Amino acid sequence: LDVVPISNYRLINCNTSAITQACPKVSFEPIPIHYCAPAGFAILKCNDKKFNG
Amino acid sequence: ENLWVTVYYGVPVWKDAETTLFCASDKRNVWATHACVPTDPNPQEIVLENVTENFNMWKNNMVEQMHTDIISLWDQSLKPCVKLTPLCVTLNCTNVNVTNEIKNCSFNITTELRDKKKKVYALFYRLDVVPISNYRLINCNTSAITQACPKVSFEPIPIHYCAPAGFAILKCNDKKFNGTGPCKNVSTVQCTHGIKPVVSTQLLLNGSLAEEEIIIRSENITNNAKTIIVQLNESVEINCTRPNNNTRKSIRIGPGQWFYATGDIIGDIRQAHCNISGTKWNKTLQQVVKKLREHFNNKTIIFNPSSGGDLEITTHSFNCGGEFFYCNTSGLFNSTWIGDTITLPCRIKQIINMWQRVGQPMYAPPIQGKIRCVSNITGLLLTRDGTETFRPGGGDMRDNWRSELYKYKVVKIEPLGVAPTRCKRFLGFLGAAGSTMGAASMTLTVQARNLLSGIKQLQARVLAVERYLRDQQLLGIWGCSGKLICCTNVPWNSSWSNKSQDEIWDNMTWMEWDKEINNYTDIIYSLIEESQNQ
Amino acid sequence: ASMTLTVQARNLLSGIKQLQARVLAVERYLRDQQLLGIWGCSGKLICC
Ligand SMILES: *[C@@H]1O[C@H](CO)[C@@H](O[C@@H]2O[C@H](CO)[C@@H](O[C@@H]3O[C@H](CO[C@H]4O[C@H](CO)[C@@H](O)[C@H](O)[C@@H]4O)[C@@H](O)[C@H](O[C@H]4O[C@H](CO)[C@@H](O)[C@H](O[C@H]5O[C@H](CO)[C@@H](O)[C@H](O)[C@@H]5O)[C@@H]4O)[C@@H]3O)[C@H](O)[C@H]2NC(C)=O)[C@H](O)[C@H]1NC(C)=O
Ligand SMILES: *[C@@H]1O[C@H](CO)[C@@H](O[C@@H]2O[C@H](CO)[C@@H](O)[C@H](O)[C@H]2NC(C)=O)[C@H](O)[C@H]1NC(C)=O
Ligand SMILES: *[C@@H]1O[C@H](CO)[C@@H](O[C@@H]2O[C@H](CO)[C@@H](O)[C@H](O)[C@H]2NC(C)=O)[C@H](O)[C@H]1NC(C)=O
Ligand SMILES: *[C@@H]1O[C@H](CO)[C@@H](O[C@@H]2O[C@H](CO)[C@@H](O)[C@H](O)[C@H]2NC(C)=O)[C@H](O)[C@H]1NC(C)=O
Ligand SMILES: *[C@@H]1O[C@H](CO)[C@@H](O[C@@H]2O[C@H](CO)[C@@H](O)[C@H](O)[C@H]2NC(C)=O)[C@H](O)[C@H]1NC(C)=O
Ligand SMILES: *[C@@H]1O[C@H](CO)[C@@H](O[C@@H]2O[C@H](CO)[C@@H](O)[C@H](O)[C@H]2NC(C)=O)[C@H](O)[C@H]1NC(C)=O
Ligand SMILES: *[C@@H]1O[C@H](CO)[C@@H](O[C@@H]2O[C@H](CO)[C@@H](O)[C@H](O)[C@H]2NC(C)=O)[C@H](O)[C@H]1NC(C)=O
Ligand SMILES: *[C@@H]1O[C@H](CO)[C@@H](O[C@@H]2O[C@H](CO)[C@@H](O)[C@H](O)[C@H]2NC(C)=O)[C@H](O)[C@H]1NC(C)=O
Ligand SMILES: *[C@@H]1O[C@H](CO)[C@@H](O[C@@H]2O[C@H](CO)[C@@H](O)[C@H](O)[C@H]2NC(C)=O)[C@H](O)[C@H]1NC(C)=O
Ligand SMILES: *[C@@H]1O[C@H](CO)[C@@H](O[C@@H]2O[C@H](CO)[C@@H](O)[C@H](O)[C@H]2NC(C)=O)[C@H](O)[C@H]1NC(C)=O
Ligand SMILES: *[C@@H]1O[C@H](CO)[C@@H](O[C@@H]2O[C@H](CO)[C@@H](O)[C@H](O)[C@H]2NC(C)=O)[C@H](O)[C@H]1NC(C)=O
Ligand SMILES: *[C@@H]1O[C@H](CO)[C@@H](O[C@@H]2O[C@H](CO)[C@@H](O)[C@H](O)[C@H]2NC(C)=O)[C@H](O)[C@H]1NC(C)=O
Ligand SMILES: *[C@@H]1O[C@H](CO)[C@@H](O[C@@H]2O[C@H](CO)[C@@H](O)[C@H](O)[C@H]2NC(C)=O)[C@H](O)[C@H]1NC(C)=O
Ligand SMILES: *[C@@H]1O[C@H](CO)[C@@H](O[C@@H]2O[C@H](CO)[C@@H](O)[C@H](O)[C@H]2NC(C)=O)[C@H](O)[C@H]1NC(C)=O
Ligand SMILES: *[C@@H]1O[C@H](CO)[C@@H](O)[C@H](O)[C@H]1NC(C)=O
Ligand SMILES: *[C@@H]1O[C@H](CO)[C@@H](O)[C@H](O)[C@H]1NC(C)=O
Ligand SMILES: *[C@@H]1O[C@H](CO)[C@@H](O)[C@H](O)[C@H]1NC(C)=O
Ligand SMILES: *[C@@H]1O[C@H](CO)[C@@H](O)[C@H](O)[C@H]1NC(C)=O
Ligand SMILES: *[C@@H]1O[C@H](CO)[C@@H](O)[C@H](O)[C@H]1NC(C)=O
Ligand SMILES: *[C@@H]1O[C@H](CO)[C@@H](O)[C@H](O)[C@H]1NC(C)=O
């Protein structure tokens, strides 16, 4: 899936852009991020069990 | 008798100052990086009655500010695109199929595959190619050539400059005002008019016109070391064209790296040129000379072509539809004055070095089809030789901007001050500046509110807050932390001022008062702080 | 020492790292002033 026919083949993105490899020491495991309010603002939360949106 | 020092805050006075201004303006135009805000759809102008202010366009720091911002916008806009360093190879150039100025060059380039090369052809203008398998691009031995980002036009967008909190921009409205001196009609504005960042070298294009007559502005009309800016009260149209039906060819250099080359030319090869009406040009010169004879004695005045230097200075350059033209103006500056259509041939270049920055060339991609544009000559840049001789010239861009910013001055508001009185313990912003103190003291809230109203903007905002707080801390120390008018118990010294209450309050303005007791402020402020601790 | 309070009060106001330092200095100044306003004597250095 990463190789495309054109001494037979080319990498799939060589005619469109630069491919950057993932930095090898960097994992992709999700870390929970909390979003918090600045001074002057507040975040309100809805607690209705059947609330759809 | 019984006079005491009273502190007033929000007093409509000011002192000259330099600061950071912000833009206001309103795809991907080179001058539209959105680094700054939209305009005010209805900005106000406040006439200051009875205000005389000394202006000096040659000491105006707004010019330096504009020059720097223009360079920055240009450079930011050219960062995200293709460099042409892969093209610095030897070219094989001939003239086999062009004419019975343009060379047909072949060369090798890379492709998206690093192990492959191919031979390609392109047309180049002679001015961009230097002989050494015969030729090299003109800047390959000195720097990297970056092509213009292909989706970015260079058409000027008016930029308004606006004052930060704590500052004001004053405008001079005298019809015959030249570069310096007192202006008897001063208005306060939020922002400047929009100024188009038009780049040109001998004639000024698309600027403002003079209202009554031609105005000749110079720092020193009697020097030879200074330029002369001549503003016309009537425009002269200049019709420029690039008649060759050039085609565009797109060449792949690498992985998403595209180069735009001139392809072949359809039809005849013709020379670029500009058309100026003969009669308007002559009327313009009779008037330019007529007003020049008012500074010069009744001597013969002659005009000659630019005396020397490179193409950027000897010719009139401009950007017309994205192409960079250089035109020969010897057909205009060639005359003697004593007590049909003009055709200027031109040249086109693709590799340019703007604002005299050596080592930073840019390649303008060719533009598909014919180009035509009509511009307004609104002024001239002249110099003098050591009969008086004038020549067109001056490649220093600050002179173009001085022709629009000459009416504006930046001042800093100084809201705190004192005056004696008998107490013991809608005009708009600065509208009261020309009023007497007894009237002006009633608009203090208007100015107090205007003290609060990228890194350079954060620094400006943080500093304005710090200034505000330093004044509030001082008032808290003296007393009356919550008031704009504060009576204290320091008695008034007739030695600071022996003027009567009527002279001070019903005749003098706050500006006059500020000057009158300017050197006692470091005494009075200390006395207030000291009496407070008793 | 209580007679030199203005000397120190004035020295509370007197790149990114400098902007952060200056913004923070302002914020702590204001927090002290807000507190004094809540207690009373918002404009005084000595408050009974
Ligand atoms: C002083 O002030 C003068 C007045 O403002 C200036 O003159 C004006 O200068 C501008 C900019 O050069 C001229 O505007 C250009 O006019 C071109 C002519 O098009 C004509 O035909 C069009 C047909 O549809 C019509 O719509 C136009 O109204 C007009 O009749 C335009 O083609 C050109 O368009 C550019 O901007 C477009 C924005 O969307 C863009 O889409 C265009 O793309 C085209 O070209 C590119 C090039 O690669 C192709 O790739 C595209 O596929 C497509 O073909 C193009 O980028 C623009 O509107 C204006 O006409 C002119 N006025 C006069 C009276 O001539 C002076 O220049 C100022 N002086 C100085 C020194 O600056
Ligand atoms: C690509 O690799 C293949 C590998 O099989 C090469 O094909 C032949 O491989 C055998 C393996 O024993 C060799 O003995 C042959 O000599 C190879 N052929 C040739 C002509 O040498 C194939 O040639 C390689 N292609 C390229 C471009 O190197
Ligand atoms: C880069 O090369 C790839 C592969 O040849 C191109 O992708 C093909 O584009 C055509 C366009 O119609 C499609 O029909 C094919 O199905 C695509 N192939 C694959 C594997 O997706 C791609 O368009 C090329 N990019 C450029 C800029 O030319
Ligand atoms: C540069 O291009 C010219 C193009 O004319 C080459 O000159 C000759 O071109 C004719 C065209 O029919 C060929 O038949 C000749 O064989 C070319 N001359 C030679 C000596 O081969 C010229 O040679 C090219 N130069 C380089 C460095 O390639
Ligand atoms: C890069 O190459 C150009 C072209 O040879 C050099 O420009 C020439 O410099 C000499 C110096 O005396 C001038 O006399 C020529 O008139 C210049 N030629 C042109 C076309 O302007 C340039 O100096 C070289 N740069 C470096 C760093 O060597
Ligand atoms: C002094 O300058 C002001 C502008 O600051 C002039 O006021 C303008 O006058 C024109 C006359 O048609 C009006 O259209 C504008 O709307 C006025 N502008 C403002 C802000 O009021 C004023 O006329 C000038 N006075 C003199 C003696 O030159
Ligand atoms: C070139 O100068 C002419 C004449 O001064 C400008 O055309 C007129 O400008 C006035 C300004 O109030 C308008 O009211 C007229 O409607 C304009 N004429 C037309 C036909 O629209 C012209 O706009 C100037 N060109 C540039 C590029 O500034
Ligand atoms: C612009 O106008 C000002 C004001 O008239 C000129 O300044 C005067 O220049 C004469 C020259 O001898 C001095 O004696 C006056 O004292 C100057 N007046 C002031 C208020 O300083 C100025 O020279 C003019 N400049 C041009 C290029 O016309
Ligand atoms: C404006 O230009 C004139 C002419 O160059 C200056 O006048 C000269 O000033 C120098 C200074 O010492 C004298 O030595 C010359 O003899 C003066 N020449 C004349 C003709 O008087 C004048 O000083 C300049 N003014 C400013 C403000 O720069
Ligand atoms: C520059 O081009 C303009 C038009 O774009 C010319 O203006 C026209 O001139 C003819 C001359 O007979 C008039 O009949 C038209 O009515 C004019 N059109 C407009 C809109 O005014 C202008 O003359 C050209 N300038 C030069 C120097 O040739
Ligand atoms: C502008 O064009 C004029 C001619 O129309 C050029 O002047 C000529 O320059 C050559 C250079 O060798 C002289 O031999 C001629 O005698 C000059 N002609 C006249 C009438 O003096 C002028 O050099 C060109 N200027 C620019 C900046 O290109
Ligand atoms: C300025 O205009 C004059 C007059 O048109 C030009 O004088 C010409 O000079 C050339 C020089 O070789 C003579 O051959 C012509 O016969 C002269 N013209 C006339 C009518 O006698 C002068 O050259 C022009 N200057 C420039 C720089 O072009
Ligand atoms: C420059 O020439 C081209 C081609 O001669 C003109 O554009 C069109 O090109 C297509 C290509 O297939 C032709 O089918 C069209 O008939 C051409 N248009 C016209 C009106 O002939 C292009 O317009 C020319 N440019 C100019 C400014 O004349
Ligand atoms: C500018 O000065 C004029 C007078 O020099 C001021 O006009 C006076 O305004 C007062 C206001 O009550 C009137 O009582 C006087 O009768 C006016 N004098 C004249 C001669 O009409 C004018 O108000 C001043 N401008 C400002 C903003 O205060
Ligand atoms: C690889 O090259 C050989 C050489 O003939 C060809 O037969 C084969 O079909 C090619 N394969 C691809 C994917 O191009
Ligand atoms: C381009 O590369 C080929 C490779 O053989 C060479 O023969 C040709 O002369 C090169 N072209 C130029 C203009 O150097
Ligand atoms: C190009 O190279 C040929 C080879 O001899 C030479 O004769 C010709 O004069 C050269 N042209 C340039 C511009 O160097
Ligand atoms: C420009 O100034 C001259 C000076 O006399 C005047 O005669 C001419 O009418 C003015 N032009 C305009 C458009 O007002
Ligand atoms: C311009 O005025 C001068 C004055 O002598 C005259 O000689 C010249 O022919 C005039 N030019 C035009 C285009 O009328
Ligand atoms: C005025 O200044 C003199 C300076 O010696 C001082 O002695 C006097 O008391 C002062 N008067 C007032 C009203 O401050």
Amino acid at B383: T
Does the distance separating the beta carbons of B252 and A14 come in below 8 Å? Answer: no
Residue with the two structure tokens 């390649």: B363
Rounded Cα distance between B521 and B417, Å, is 8
The dihedrals phi and psi of B429, each to the nearest 5 degrees, come to -60, 125
User: How far, rounded to the nearest angstrom, does the alpha carbon of residue B213 sit from its chain's CA centroid?
Assistant: 23
Enter the tokens of residue B217.
């502005």
List of residues 6+ apart from B65 with CB closer than 8 A: B20, B21, B161
Question: Is the sign of the CA dihedral A18, A23, A28, A31 positive or negative?
Answer: negative
Dmax (CA) of chain C: 42
Indicate the top mutation candidate among A6, A9, A10, A15 to test ligand 3's pocket, ranked by most ligand atoms within 8 A of CB: A15
For residue B361, CA distances in Å to B84, B141, B259, B317, B365 come to 10, 12, 15, 16, 13
The single-letter DSSP state of residue B13 is -
The single-letter DSSP state of residue B235 is E
Q: Which chains touch C (3 or more CB pairs under 8 A)?
A: B
Indicate the top mutation candidate among B245, B370, B371 to test ligand 13's pocket, ranked by most ligand atoms within 8 A of CB: B245
Least Cα separation, residue C9 to chain B (angstroms) = 9
Interface of B with A (CB under 8 A): 112-113, 252, 255-256
Residues of chain A positioned with their CB less than 8 A from the CB of B110: none
Q: Give strand ranges (E) for B285-327.
A: 301-303, 316-320, 323-327
Rounded Cα distance between B260 and B150, Å, is 8
CA count, 13 A, side-chain hemisphere, B534: 8
Residue with the two structure tokens 């308004």: B160
List of residues 6+ apart from B449 with CB closer than 8 A: none
How many Cβ atoms sit within 10 Å of the Cβ of residue B289? 19
Question: Is the sign of the CA dihedral B326, B327, B333, B334 positive or negative?
Answer: positive
List of residues 6+ apart from B469 with CB closer than 8 A: C13, C26, C29
Amino acid at B247: T
User: Nearest residue of C to residue B533 by CA position?
Assistant: C3
How many Cβ atoms sit within 10 Å of the Cβ of residue B418? 23
* Ligand 13 proximal residues by C-beta, below 6 Å: B 245, 266, 369-370
User: How far, rounded to the nearest angstrom, does the alpha carbon of residue A49 sit from its chain's CA centroid?
Assistant: 30
Rounded Cα distance between B137 and C39, Å, is 76
The dihedrals phi and psi of B55, each to the nearest 5 degrees, come to -105, 150
Does the distance separating the beta carbons of B255 and A17 come in below 8 Å? Answer: yes
User: How far, rounded to the nearest angstrom, does the alpha carbon of residue C44 sit from its chain's CA centroid?
Assistant: 12
The single-letter DSSP state of residue B210 is P
Enter the tokens of residue B341.
């259509």
DSSP strand pairing (B388-392 vs B301-303): parallel
Note whether C9 and C45 are within 8 A (CB): yes
How many Cβ atoms sit within 10 Å of the Cβ of residue A32? 4
List of residues 6+ apart from B229 with CB closer than 8 A: B179, B204, B216, B217, B218, B379, B380, B381, B399, B402, B403
Closest CA to B224 of B307, B168, B283, B150: B307
Separation of CA B268 and ligand 1 centre (Å): 23
The single-letter DSSP state of residue B223 is -
For residue A45, CA distances in Å to A37, A51, B311 come to 13, 11, 68
Separation of CA A8 and ligand 2 centre (Å): 12
Least Cα separation, residue C43 to chain B (angstroms) = 5
Helix axes B62-77, B398-405, angle to 10 degrees: 120
In angstroms, this model's resolution equals 3.5
DSSP strand pairing (B92-94 vs B102-110): antiparallel
State the best of A4, A8, A13, A14 to mutate against chain B, taking most chain B CBs within 10 Å: A14
Indicate the top mutation candidate among B91, B94, B117 to test ligand 4's pocket, ranked by most ligand atoms within 8 A of CB: B94
The beta-carbon neighbor of C10 closest among B458, B465, B473 is B473
- Print burial letters for B463-498: b (CB count within 10 Å at least 16), e (below 16): bbbbbbbeebbbbbbbbbbeebebbbebebbeebbe
Q: Can you tell me whether residue A53 is helix, strand or coil?
A: coil
Q: Can you tell me whether residue B231 is helix, strand or coil?
A: strand
Amino acid at A19: I
How many Cβ atoms sit within 10 Å of the Cβ of residue B356? 11
Rounded Cα distance between B488 and B528, Å, is 7
For residue A29, CA distances in Å to A26, A32, A34, A36 come to 9, 10, 16, 22
* Ligand 19 proximal residues by C-beta, below 6 Å: B 278-279, 282
- Print burial letters for B386-410: b (CB count within 10 Å at least 16), e (below 16): eeeebbbbbbbbeebbbbbbbbbbb
User: Nearest residue of B to residue C6 by CA position?
Assistant: B477
Residue with the two structure tokens 């943080």: B462
Rounded Cα distance between B465 and B467, Å, is 5
Separation of CA B87 and ligand 5 centre (Å): 19
Phi-psi region of B433 (alpha: psi -120 to 50; beta: other; left: phi over 0): alpha
How many Cβ atoms sit within 10 Å of the Cβ of residue C4? 8
Rounded Cα distance between B233 and B378, Å, is 8
Dmax (CA) of chain A: 64
Question: Is the sign of the CA dihedral B440, B443, B449, B453 positive or negative?
Answer: negative
Residue B418: strand pairing partners = B7
Closest CA to B431 of B180, B168, B192: B168
Closest CA to B4 of B533, B527, B534, B530: B527
How many Cβ atoms sit within 10 Å of the Cβ of residue C9? 15
Helices (H) then strands (E): counts for chain A: 0, 2
Enter the tokens of residue B336.
């003697």
Closest CA to B496 of B1, B5, B2: B5
Note whether C33 and B468 are within 8 A (CB): no
Query: Any alpha helices (H) in B26-95, and if so which ranges?
Result: 62-77
Residue B262: strand pairing partners = B123, B248
Q: Give strand ranges (E) for B279-352.
A: 301-303, 316-320, 323-327, 335-337, 341-349, 351-352
Amino acid at B387: T
Rounded Cα distance between B57 and B64, Å, is 11
Note whether B169 and B192 are within 8 A (CB): yes
Separation of CA B134 and ligand 17 centre (Å): 6
Closest CA to B110 of B255, B249, B262: B255
Residue A11: strand pairing partners = A3
Closest CA to B66 of B207, B160, B205: B160
Note whether B395 and B313 are within 8 A (CB): yes
Protein residue whose Cα sits closest to atom 9 of ligand 19: B282
Residue B325: strand pairing partners = B318, B348
Query: Any alpha helices (H) in chain C, and if so which ranges?
Result: 5-9, 16-39
List of residues 6+ apart from B186 with CB closer than 8 A: B47, B48, B51, B52, B53, B170, B171, B172, B173
Annotate B106-163 with three-state secondary structure. Answer: EEEEECCCCCCEEEEEEEEEHHHEEECCCEEECCCCCCCCEECCCCCCCCCCCEEEEC
Note whether B361 and B139 are within 8 A (CB): yes
Find the ligand nearest to B181 CA: 8
List of residues 6+ apart from A46 with CB closer than 8 A: none
Amino acid at B376: N
Note whether B21 and B412 are within 8 A (CB): no
Rounded Cα distance between B7 and A47, Å, is 56
How many Cβ atoms sit within 10 Å of the Cβ of residue B458? 13
Enter the tokens of residue B307.
């005396």
Note whether B254 and B86 are within 8 A (CB): yes
Protein residue whose Cα sits closest to atom 8 of ligand 15: A8
Separation of CA B518 and ligand 20 centre (Å): 17
Note whether B178 and B217 are within 8 A (CB): yes
List of residues 6+ apart from C4 with CB closer than 8 A: none
DSSP strand pairing (B228-242 vs B167-172): unpaired
Enter the tokens of residue B177.
């005002």
Rounded Cα distance between B172 and B57, Å, is 11
